[PDB]
Design a protein around this ligand. Structure first.
Ligand SMILES: *[C@@H]1O[C@H](CO)[C@@H](O)[C@H](O)[C@H]1NC(C)=O
Lengths: 49, 36
């Protein structure tokens, strides 16, 4: 009951700082001035730009 | 040769930016009118 794994950990932070880290997908180009939803850098919302 | 504080140790609490926000906080901060 002590077979080997070398423990591994999560990393995670709650908005308290600059945004820098996520695995890039298509990474679209932005529009403006038309109430459209955004998943902006992971932080999401709808409204205008 | 101690020396009293008037107004020191005032720092925006985190990288976040509030804007015209009469806000409040609490963490390890500077006691006021204390003597350094
Ligand atoms: C600050 O506090 C110390 C400790 O009681 C006191 O001796 C001093 O007179 C006070 N005022 C100063 C340093 O201006």
């Amino acid at each position: 009951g002590y077979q080997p794994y070398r423990v591994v950990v999560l990393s995670f932070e709650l908005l308290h700082a600059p945004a820098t880290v996520c695995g890039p997908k298509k990474s679209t180009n932005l529009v403006k001035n038309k109430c459209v939803n955004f998943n902006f850098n992971g932080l999401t919302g709808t409204g205008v730009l | 040769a101690y020396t009293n504080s008037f107004t020191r140790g005032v720092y925006y609490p985190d990288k976040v930016f509030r804007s015209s926000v009469l806000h409040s906080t609490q963490d390890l901060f500077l006691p006021f009118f204390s003597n350094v």
